[PDB]
Amino acid sequence: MINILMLIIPILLAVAFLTLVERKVLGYMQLRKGPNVVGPYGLLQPIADAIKLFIKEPLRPATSSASMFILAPIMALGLALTMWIPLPMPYPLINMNLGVLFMLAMSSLAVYSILWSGWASNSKYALIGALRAVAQTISYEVTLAIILLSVLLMSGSFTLSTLITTQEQMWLILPAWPLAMMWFISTLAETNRAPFDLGPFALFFMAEYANIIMMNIFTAILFLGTSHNPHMPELYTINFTIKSLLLTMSFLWIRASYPRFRYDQLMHLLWKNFLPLTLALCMWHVSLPILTSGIP
Amino acid sequence: XXXXXXXXXXXXXXXXXXXXXXXXXXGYSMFAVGIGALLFGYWSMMKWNRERRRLQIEDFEARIALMPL
């Protein structure tokens, strides 16, 4: 068992090397030059941010309540890194008995990361804004469970390995046309700062940007696939990375192009408008395997 | 001779011109492609599930065939 370290260390580098992508690709959107001075094309800057924040930068806590504040980043980073384990890939590390149920569970527990940070500060000034940030994540998790089930009820069980085999000739974007549009918006609620925005503070960046890649990959399993090929692992590995990278560009697209939707009208897009739409499509997706034979 | 700043207008840069116009999508035509992709989506998907049934019955047949197990 050495492969676990081969899924944390290159992943922590992927969150680090995001700092290039998150302001150079975002840079050309805004007609500005991103990283250039630090490296040949700014490749030395992502690792330079780590030396700046981890070692030299000291701490000044508000109150430091015994166990908390030095426990919230462990829940933030821990839950973000454990999400990589059930991922199907070409081959998964320790494949669970049911796949997507583990995926929804560790994301619903990832709400605590922003909850314990609100309890860390003694002031009332911070906790009201902290609970508002919880409301952005907690509300969209209702619909996230519904849109997941509609894709599953079309084909395959909860296992993530079966979701690759069902996409043999055509993608799941075409049968789930309005549902694919939902996953572009619903994923951005989890601290992406595109439709709505709120030492150890630096550790939250390493956890929040990790979930951004996680939602990009998870959308490329439920809706993308193209080919499987069990005999050739070479063809799948390259083709999967390009599909995930194109979704990473769309995540940074919303951050630059579109203003914030307001907190009150975030509950008018969802609940008032999205929840009647998602359930109507869920009603449609119950009838689909009954109308025409479609059972795994 | 006196030399000062000379006046030039030429094309006048066009004073207030509309650039925003309807492109690609018309209205009713987008629904023909939109709902058309859905109807093509279900028909292609359900044929694969019927091909899955060929594998499904054959998979469970292996358990019935194996009695020394």
UniProtKB/Swiss-Prot annotation, chain A:
InterPro entries, A to Z: NADH_UbQ_OxRdtase_su1/FPO, NADH_UbQ_OxRdtase_su1_CS
GO molecular function, one term: NADH dehydrogenase (ubiquinone) activity
Primary location: mitochondrion
GO cellular component, as recorded: mitochondrial inner membrane; respiratory chain complex I
Example of a GO biological process term: mitochondrial respiratory chain complex I assembly
EC number: 7.1.1.2
Reaction catalyzed: a ubiquinone + NADH + 5 H(+)(in) = a ubiquinol + NAD(+) + 4 H(+)(out)
Localization of this protein: Mitochondrion inner membrane
Pfam families with a match to the protein in the record: NADHdh
Keyword DNA-binding among UniProt keywords: no
Sequence intervals crossing the membrane: 1-20, 68-88, 98-118, 144-164, 170-190, 203-223, 234-254, 275-295
Topological category with respect to the lipid bilayer: Multi-pass membrane protein
Keywords: Electron transport, Formylation, Membrane, Mitochondrion, Mitochondrion inner membrane, NAD, Respiratory chain, Translocase, Transmembrane, Transmembrane helix, Transport, Ubiquinone
Signal peptide bounds: none
Similarity field: Belongs to the complex I subunit 1 family.
HAMAP family: NDH1_NuoH
UniProt-listed PANTHER family: NADH DEHYDROGENASE SUBUNIT 1 (PTHR11432), NADH-UBIQUINONE OXIDOREDUCTASE CHAIN 1 (PTHR11432:SF3)
Protein purpose: Core subunit of the mitochondrial membrane respiratory chain NADH dehydrogenase (Complex I) which catalyzes electron transfer from NADH through the respiratory chain, using ubiquinone as an electron acceptor. Essential for the catalytic activity of complex I. Essential for the assembly of complex I.
Assembly and oligomerization: Core subunit of respiratory chain NADH dehydrogenase (Complex I) which is composed of 45 different subunits.
Entry protein name: NADH-ubiquinone oxidoreductase chain 1
Organism: Bos taurus (Bovine)
UniProtKB/Swiss-Prot annotation, chain B:
Function statement: Accessory subunit of the mitochondrial membrane respiratory chain NADH dehydrogenase (Complex I), that is believed not to be involved in catalysis. Complex I functions in the transfer of electrons from NADH to the respiratory chain. The immediate electron acceptor for the enzyme is believed to be ubiquinone. Involved in the interferon/all-trans-retinoic acid (IFN/RA) induced cell death. This apoptotic activity is inhibited by interaction with viral IRF1. Prevents the transactivation of STAT3 target genes.
Intracellular or extracellular location(s): Mitochondrion inner membrane; Nucleus
Highest taxon listed in the record's lineage: Eukaryota
First-to-last residue of the parent protein present: 32 to 74 of 144
Protein name: NADH dehydrogenase [ubiquinone] 1 alpha subcomplex subunit 13
Subunit structure: Complex I is composed of 45 different subunits. Interacts with CARD15, but not with CARD4. Interacts with STAT3, but not with STAT1, STAT2 and STAT5A. Interacts with OLFM4.
Organism, scientific name: Bos taurus
Family: Belongs to the complex I NDUFA13 subunit family.
TM segment ranges: 27-46
